[PDB]
Amino acid sequence: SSDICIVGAGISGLTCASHLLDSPACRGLSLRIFDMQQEAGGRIRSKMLDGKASIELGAGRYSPQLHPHFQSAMQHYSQKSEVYPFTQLKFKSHVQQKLKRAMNELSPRLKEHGKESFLQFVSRYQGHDSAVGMIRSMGYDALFLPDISAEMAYDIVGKHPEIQSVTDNDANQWFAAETGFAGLIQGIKAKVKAAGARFSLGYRLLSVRTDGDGYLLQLAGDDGWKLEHRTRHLILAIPPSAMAGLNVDFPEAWSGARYGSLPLFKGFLTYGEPWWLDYKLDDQVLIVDNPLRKIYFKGDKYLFFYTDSEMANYWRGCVAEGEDGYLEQIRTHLASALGIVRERIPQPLAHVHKYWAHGVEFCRDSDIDHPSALSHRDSGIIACSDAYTEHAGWMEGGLLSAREASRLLLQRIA
Amino acid sequence: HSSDICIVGAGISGLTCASHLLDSPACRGLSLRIFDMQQEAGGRIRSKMLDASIELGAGRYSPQLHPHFQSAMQHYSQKSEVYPFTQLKFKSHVQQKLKRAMNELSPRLKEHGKESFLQFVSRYQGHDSAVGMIRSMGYDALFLPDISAEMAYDIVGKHPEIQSVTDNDANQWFAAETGFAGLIQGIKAKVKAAGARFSLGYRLLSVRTDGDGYLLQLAGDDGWKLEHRTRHLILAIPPSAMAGLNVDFPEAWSGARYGSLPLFKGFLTYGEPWWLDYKLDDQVLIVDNPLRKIYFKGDKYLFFYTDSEMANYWRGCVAEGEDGYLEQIRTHLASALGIVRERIPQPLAHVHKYWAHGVEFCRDIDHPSALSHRDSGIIACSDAYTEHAGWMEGGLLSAREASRLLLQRIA
Numbered sequence: 140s141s142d143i144c145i146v147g148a149g150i151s152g153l154t155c156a157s158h159l160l161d162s163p164a165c166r167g168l169s170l171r172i173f174d175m176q177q178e179a180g181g182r183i184r185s186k187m188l189d190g191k192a193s194i195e196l197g198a199g200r201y202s203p204q205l206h207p208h209f210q211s212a213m214q215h216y217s218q219k220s221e222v223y224p225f226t227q228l229k230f231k232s233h234v235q236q237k238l239k240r241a242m243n244e245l246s247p248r249l250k251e252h253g254k255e256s257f258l259q260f261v262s263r264y265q266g267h268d269s270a271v272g273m274i275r276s277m278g279y280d281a282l283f284l285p286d287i288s289a290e291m292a293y294d295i296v297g298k299h300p301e302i303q304s305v306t307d308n309d310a311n312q313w314f315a316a317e318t319g320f321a322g323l324i325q326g327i328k329a330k331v332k333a334a335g336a337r338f339s340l341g342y343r344l345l346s347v348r349t350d351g352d353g354y355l356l357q358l359a360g361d362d363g364w365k366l367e368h369r370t371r372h373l374i375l376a377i378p379p380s381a382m383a384g385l386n387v388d389f390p391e392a393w394s395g396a397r398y399g400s401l402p403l404f405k406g407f408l409t410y411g412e413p414w415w416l417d418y419k420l421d422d423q424v425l426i427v428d429n430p431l432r433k434i435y436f437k438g439d440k441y442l443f444f445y446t447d448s449e450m451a452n453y454w455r456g457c458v459a460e461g462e463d464g465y466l467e468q469i470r471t472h473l474a475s476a477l478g479i480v481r482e483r484i485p486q487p488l489a490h491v492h493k494y495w496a497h498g499v500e501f502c503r504d505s506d507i508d509h510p511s512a513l514s515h516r517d518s519g520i521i522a523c524s525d526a527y528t529e530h531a532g533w534m535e536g537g538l539l540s541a542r543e544a545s546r547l548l549l550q551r552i553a
Numbered sequence: 554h555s556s557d558i559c560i561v562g563a564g565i566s567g568l569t570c571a572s573h574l575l576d577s578p579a580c581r582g583l584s585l586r587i588f589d590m591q592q593e594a595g596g597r598i599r600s601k602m603l604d605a606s607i608e609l610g611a612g613r614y615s616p617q618l619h620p621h622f623q624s625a626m627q628h629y630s631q632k633s634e635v636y637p638f639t640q641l642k643f644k645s646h647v648q649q650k651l652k653r654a655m656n657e658l659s660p661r662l663k664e665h666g667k668e669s670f671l672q673f674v675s676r677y678q679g680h681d682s683a684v685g686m687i688r689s690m691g692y693d694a695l696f697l698p699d700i701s702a703e704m705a706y707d708i709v710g711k712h713p714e715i716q717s718v719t720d721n722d723a724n725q726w727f728a729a730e731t732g733f734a735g736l737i738q739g740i741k742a743k744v745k746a747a748g749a750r751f752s753l754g755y756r757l758l759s760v761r762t763d764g765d766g767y768l769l770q771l772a773g774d775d776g777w778k779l780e781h782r783t784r785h786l787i788l789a790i791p792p793s794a795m796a797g798l799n800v801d802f803p804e805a806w807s808g809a810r811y812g813s814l815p816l817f818k819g820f821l822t823y824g825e826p827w828w829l830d831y832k833l834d835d836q837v838l839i840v841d842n843p844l845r846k847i848y849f850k851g852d853k854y855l856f857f858y859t860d861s862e863m864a865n866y867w868r869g870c871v872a873e874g875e876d877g878y879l880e881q882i883r884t885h886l887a888s889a890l891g892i893v894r895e896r897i898p899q900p901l902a903h904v905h906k907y908w909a910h911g912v913e914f915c916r917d918i919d920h921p922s923a924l925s926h927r928d929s930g931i932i933a934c935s936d937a938y939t940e941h942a943g944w945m946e947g948g949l950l951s952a953r954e955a956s957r958l959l960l961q962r963i964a
């Protein structure tokens with residue numbers, strides 16, 4: 140039993156708990172937090188790669204200019220930042236050299252045709268083949284999706300560090316966590332534990348039913364243990380996709396809005412030799428047409444690649460087919476990317492990867508205002524997610540959603 | 554995604570099927586795929602370093618009961634240590650009487666041995682005495698209605714802490730020096746070297762025949778959906794898992810009835826082996842309180858081991874939270890020893906594992922050691938199908954027969 144229950148211990152749920160426990164109105168209300176994983180953090184997942192480097196399987200970078208709440212959170216929890224270097228393309232293709240002009244040329248036509256898919260928009264003016272070549276040169280395959288509009292594309296381009304120069308956003312600075320954003324999650328978790336929150340990690344919420352004034356939750360432990368939990372006030376700090384399992388009629392009983400999703404994949408590789416130093420690639424990113432798409436060389440420590448949408452599914456299928464083939468593909472694509480023979484790319488030492496079936500979730504384009512958090516029209520359950528915000532796909536959005544979700548719960552309590 | 558042979562389940566059963574099959578000339582060069590829903594092989598064998606290596610799952614074997622298992626340890630160069638928990642040094646008055654009382658009941662297994670163990674003992678001793686006597690053996694499965702009297706004597710005679718009650722105290726016991734995970738690693742390494750490919754982290758959801766072959770639907774632990782085509786399939790999973798698939802288990806396979814019960818272990822370490830003061834090093838106490846069987850391993854750690862309704866008890870306790878869980882343990886340790894709680898220190902670290910289907914078994918028949926689906930030819934492999942249900946030996950026996958059956962399909 141609890142007075143307040145939050146399901147989801149990513150940055151959104153944890154920040155809800157933090158706001159609530161900071162409020163005098165929550166004094167003497169017990170708070171229980173559930174998550175289906177054994178550790179908090181959600182799509183923030185730091186890992187030490189073979190004892191050599193702390194890497195981010197999920198969220199990896201932030202900008203003080205774009206993400207002031209997150210900057211403040213990092214400072215509040217005494218977390219060390221370091222410069223994030225991948226904010227320009229040192230080695231542009233001929234296509235990439237023309238991107239800023241190509242995008243600028245098209246931008247006045249957003250007024251007339253900006254709601255259509257970015258692919259169709261670019262094709263309207265350049266034709267299919269040219270559009271394909273131009274779009275692909277930015278490294279984010281979401282830009283090819285029918286449900287990513289030209290408007291949304293210019294927003295994506297302007298907010299991602301590697302290609303922010305394309306829309307003249309070079310001034311935004313970027314940082315990463317020296318020892319991983321999991322440290323921020325741990326900091327928040329320690330604060331809310333100290334204030335009396337109780338954590339029940341490794342339980343998946345299966346269903347919710349009202350029952351008198353409150354709610355009865357059915358959960359399952361990752362070891363099979365079934366648990367029923369009664370609460371008076373409920374925040375579901377989970378993404379839109381997660382809202383479906385449950386029997387809460389999402390989204391029709393909430394916004395009636397539509398939500399998009401796309402998958403993400405990151406693969407990190409260590410090597411015996413920091414072989415890329417010789418090609419002056421340390422702390423640089425290459426954006427390529429081949430399936431690696433965006434290739435990052437971190438100092439002299441490791442490299443990684445990052446894909447989305449169709450290409451994230453491509454990679455996860457390759458992983459399913461076997462480790463040997465997956466590594467061989469990476470080696471082949473590294474060689475093509477650099478213009479050197481395959482045998483001149485070494486075999487790797489230790490490597491790790493992560494596929495996120497719903498890595499990014501977001502509000503589809505609408506003329507109808509969408510609040511930062513939602514409420515179930517009959518039961519008053521609150522929904523909290525980065526996806527509900529203008530910062531969907533960024534930690535800042537979760538912090539924004541959590542402020543509003545806490546606000547709504549506090550109004551329910553009052 | 555395809556194979557000649559597919560094994561689902563990388564516990565000791567499935568891994569041993571792969572080993573047998575890859576050893577056979579008939580499987581030279583065949584493509585063999587092994588799936589498991591977990592990210593590491595071993596199943597109910599799970600070793601861990603307790604901040605000493607400990608066994609969260611299977612923990613002991615006997616050369617006398619378990620010749621196939623002993624032979625595997627010997628074959629894979631796995632070293633053993635003496636398992637000291639084979640007698641009760643601090644017997645209660647009821648425990649002192651167990652051997653005589655079980656002796657007296659034994660002839661009556663001919664007449665009423667298919668009744669539950671509780672009903673069988675109650676028939677002759679009355680409910681209260683029966684309860685007191687059955688409880689003193691420390692295995693709460695002995696109270697279950699699915700456990701016959703004949704099954705209960707088999708259980709009592711095969712468990713090291715109580716084997717003396719049925720005059721089996723000649724049977725010797727060992728643990729793995731480096732953990733049974735080393736044996737699993739050994740087997741995995743041998744089958745990988747022989748060309749087996751592993752897909753760990755995938756849950757088999759369903760199967761259909763696909764003319765000549767089988768089409769499996771699997772899901773990755775990260776949500777990725779995978780279909781796999783194979784020509785020969787072994788489901789090396791327990792009956793509970795089989796019943797979750799769409800393969801009409803148990804009706805199309807044996808029509809026998811299977812049971813299951815949960816297990817729980819909890820391990821604790823401390824700043825001193827405080828139990829050395831009570832001469833408890835390398836002893837086991839069997840008590841009426843919820844800990845039930847309490848083990849003190851040399852001067853290194855202690856652990857407790859419960860089953861059936863008491864495993865559920867502890868798992869609920871964990872769900873309520875770590876503080877209450879650990880204070881419950883401290884309280885029950887004091888009561889078992891007959892000392893004040895203050896004399897028991899707080900632990901430095903602890904770990905626990907609940908297994909919702911820790912033991913699966915055939916209730917009761919010429920039950921073969923591995924099963925075939927009557928129409929589809931899919932083969933089922935589990936310790937539960939054998940006369941050593943709930944022991945690694947049983948998995949090795951089932952694997953022998955599963956491999957034999959599959960090699961028969963192949964020819």
Ligand SMILES: Cc1cc2nc3c(=O)[nH]c(=O)nc-3n(C[C@H](O)[C@H](O)[C@H](O)COP(=O)(O)OP(=O)(O)OC[C@H]3O[C@@H](n4cnc5c(N)ncnc54)[C@H](O)[C@@H]3O)c2cc1C
Nearest residue numbers: 147149150151175181182197198199200344498525533534
């Ligand atoms: C590869 C990748 C890269 C990223 N890059 C960046 C970046 O560089 N910068 C940036 O700012 N952001 C980045 N993001 C986004 C950032 O990760 C998200 O905006 C943010 O972490 C979302 O937080 P959240 O708490 O709303 O949701 P989540 O982090 O998804 O947390 C939701 C939680 O709910 C739990 N849950 C769901 N359903 C249930 C259920 N039924 N029962 C119990 N628990 C449940 C989940 O286990 C999860 O822990 C990235 C994300 C990914 C995947």
Ligand SMILES: Cc1cc2nc3c(=O)[nH]c(=O)nc-3n(C[C@H](O)[C@H](O)[C@H](O)COP(=O)(O)OP(=O)(O)OC[C@H]3O[C@@H](n4cnc5c(N)ncnc54)[C@H](O)[C@@H]3O)c2cc1C
Nearest residue numbers: 562564565566589590596597610611612613757794944945
């Ligand atoms: C607490 C405990 C103590 C024990 N003590 C001992 C002992 O001291 N001595 C002894 O000999 N034995 C002991 N055992 C028993 C022993 O562990 C089992 O007899 C043996 O490990 C069973 O092996 P198996 O391969 O048949 O089954 P399992 O080890 O259960 O292996 C089955 C595998 O199938 C996988 N799986 C199941 N369903 C699916 C699916 N749908 N898709 C994909 N994968 C699937 C599971 O992940 C699992 O890895 C103990 C067991 C427990 C739980």
Ligand SMILES: N[C@@H](Cc1c[nH]c2ccccc12)C(=O)O
Nearest residue numbers: 279281295299447499531532533
């Ligand atoms: N902002 C995250 C995720 C993200 C938001 N929108 C996206 C569109 C495509 C791919 C990823 C994203 C990143 O830096 O990666």
Ligand SMILES: N[C@@H](Cc1c[nH]c2ccccc12)C(=O)O
Nearest residue numbers: 692694708712860912942943944
């Ligand atoms: N043989 C295993 C498990 C086991 C088999 N049958 C049982 C009945 C009850 C409890 C445990 C068991 C052990 O040593 O623990």
